[model samples]
Target: RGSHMIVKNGEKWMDRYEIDSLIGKGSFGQVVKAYDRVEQEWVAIKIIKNKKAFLNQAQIEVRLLELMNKHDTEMKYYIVHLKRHFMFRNHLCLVFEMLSYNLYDLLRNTNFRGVSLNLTRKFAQQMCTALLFLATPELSIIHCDLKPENILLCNPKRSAIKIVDFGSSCQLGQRIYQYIQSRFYRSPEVLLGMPYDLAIDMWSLGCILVEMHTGEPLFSGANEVDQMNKIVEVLGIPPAHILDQAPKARKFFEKLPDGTWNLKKTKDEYKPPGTRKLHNILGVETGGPGGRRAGESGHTVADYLKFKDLILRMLDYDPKTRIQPYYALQHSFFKK
Candidate 1:
């Protein structure tokens, strides 16, 4: 089993694909850029770790990719497609179409200051389309993880992006594991141990769009407690009804006499501080009727309102009431 050092570059797979270089690595496994001799092109091959636990996840990812590929059409290719799969040195290898960079890389290139309003809209619209497709009644796939790192650019110009990494994906009602999503992008429902669904993806999308606009994570928390604190700082504590639905709510919060909730932390524990309104953070002027500032680009102001509105809906504390991707796609924000 140890004979095949999977880390070796220049290794050949199926005697047809040559491992070119390592692309990235994560909990599940490492992905490598490979030269597909048969196709005469480059492809990304994700090599799952040769462990029982990881193998199980790799199989699920393979199945999910297959399902997505089968249903994909020319008009909408939001999810990455799996070209093929084969076993290599006791590890599961998944071949995918080569894509250039990822959204996280793009964010870094911009120095994390965020992107233009128009660009944020373009990315948000595409993400909404992808989520809508996954949330379709028949499909109902829950992308357990939906952060910028999982979103890839299809080209150098960033004209298109596709959602990748199905290792953490599962059907809506068939959750395979309890915990999911990265800390920053994790939905409140997931954190509070509430029964979650596709709405969690919407929440993550909101966080991603915010980062794309502000060049930093909207809810950057160091730990689970801090994460919850950051979210509450910006969105206010979850409503009683919402907290009531969460099985683990009490672990992180306490109910106050006046009906407001308090974080378990000591400092400022009475209730979360007033929200840092999205408009203020995004530099949108909320004074005017249309929320536009004098001398501000009209297009930018309109886009800001539209984006903010959608984010508000997406980040709603109540998962049941959170705007579904289908409805979000139809929102005025995506019109242009």
Candidate 2:
């Protein structure tokens, strides 16, 4: 960690803002609630750690935020807005409109039972709208990381949410790092070392949607190896073409002489449990084991089916075939 001085509550920045409280901290920097003296309003400020590496990342983040913010004014609320950025004590500071708690914090408040299906659908639709904006050909931004922690609720009661954190974001066809996204939301293309694109965000959206309904991550893997196993157990092994395309396929799977594939493991010998279909996990009656009839889960068969279909498309292993955010927003499930 850099030995730079940490800003305390009541500390002034550029004679314009007074730090109120620390909001959170991460590898790159810390976010704090601040009172803007000039605008006479409150805002959130992200202060990059006083290190050369973090300063470079902060610059990229500010640039991406500016690009996205420029196009966001015409759309319904989609992403957090970057108000300003400056330097303070050798640390890069970014200003943003303060928002309410993140999705993860809201989930915890619900005692982890997750929100109702109606709310889940609303959240999913809004997220799709935001993603669709990013997917525009003019923008083509790839949210390298998309998860509950980065999605903030606009208020305590409404379903409105906004995407935050562009520090890991990059344009489509441009990759900043081989490893991105939180473990549970990481897509197969990223885990398998395949060149990824915007489809990766769709995969993360699928995971986030499932977690909103189930109150738990759909795939909670302990490590990269275990994470891949969790995904395979649910989605089945990647097709031959997908596996062939991944540069690190052998590290995760072994091709057998019998034309079958198995997870490469050591003496621990971790074998994945039986696959759990999404419908069953969501308690939607699909006649699958552990599934309940549609009415039993307070959902109609038609609605459940539509929702399931949308999720399946989002989670497709083939990135080329994965549903884009624009198409996802038009799915039958969101029509309601």
Candidate 3:
């Protein structure tokens, strides 16, 4: 009222919210710490502006959030928010629950220092819980983007891991998208442009877990070809039959400097460089071409077998043979 007169309607959201500091930013919008004067509580309001280029992005985000909110209690680690519909600058605005710093900040502060095994285990268990809940046959939701940046730690002290960023998530049974995950954590099928389901999430899970342990991305590659090379460096070349099942999968290998598209033709003997095999560490290696079967690779490292077993289950290259979220949770490694 100092120099400007207050109009009957200054703004649609006037007095409804008091914008505070900026909390976080994303591809589409920024989340600000805000005060809901009427409710007398602090909340994070996500202000999203519609850009013609990303026409359907906003609707996609809203729809995913609506579906996700139904299981809010089960997804405490995620960024849960109450969507407030409003008008701003003649554009639609959506507000989300405010959270503290994100996982990326924590990682940067840690300087990529590896998280403790116990903490990693706790996070893995929580992720399993969330994934298991989403695995309900009818829901069949797949969080296409599962990188560290998308993960939020509610309380670092409690080791609570919350996954956010549904900008790329999709209902598995309904609409399927191609090459959805971040480059480093992208699944093999996604790289091959094949039809996929929830298994892609599991693949991302494996990549993330390894990154947490290494204090860096498991596969840091500029392009798909380099990414495959990095993968082979860790998991070894795919077996002949595994490569044959999907020929397109050979593109990544073929593009490499010393790449061999067909796993069967590659003369490279990818013996486990580390002392332990994948199943030996994860404790749930079921016998299969990709998984640690009893006869295929009899060698096992008892000390880390449990952890390895869990990783192998996730790294299964064969889409058909890959473990579903429900069955993955029931794996022997997580049974105890």
* Model 1: lDDT to the true structure: 0.81
Cα lDDT of model 3 by residue, 188-303, tens digit: 77776666788888888877775665467767778777666667766776655555566577574443444435332333333332333444233344432123333433323441
Q: Give the distance in Å from residue 12's predicted Cα in candidate 2 to where it truly belongs.
A: 2.6
Residue 124, candidate 2: how far off, in angstroms?
A: 0.6
For candidate 2, the lDDT comes to: 0.80
Which residue pairs in candidate 1 collide? 112-215
For residue 200, give model 2's deviation from the true position in Å: 0.2
Regions of candidate 2 where Cα sits further than 4 Å from its true position: 1-4, 258-260, 269-274, 286-298
Q: Where is model 3 more than 4 Å wrong at Cα?
A: 1-13, 53-55, 71-79, 173-179, 239-242, 245-247, 254-303, 331-336
Error of 3 at 126 (Å): 1.1
Clashes of 2: 0
Candidate 1: tens digits of C-alpha lDDT, residues 286-335: 53223333364544567668878889999999887999876888898877
lDDT of each: 0.81, 0.80, 0.63
Q: TM-scores, in order shown?
A: 0.91, 0.91, 0.76
**What is candidate 2's lDDT per residue for 21-124, written digit by digit as tens?**
98888777788999999899889888787787677777878887677766744553778888888887777888899888898988898777777678789889
TM-score, cand. 2: 0.91
Best-to-worst order by TM-score is: 2, 1, 3
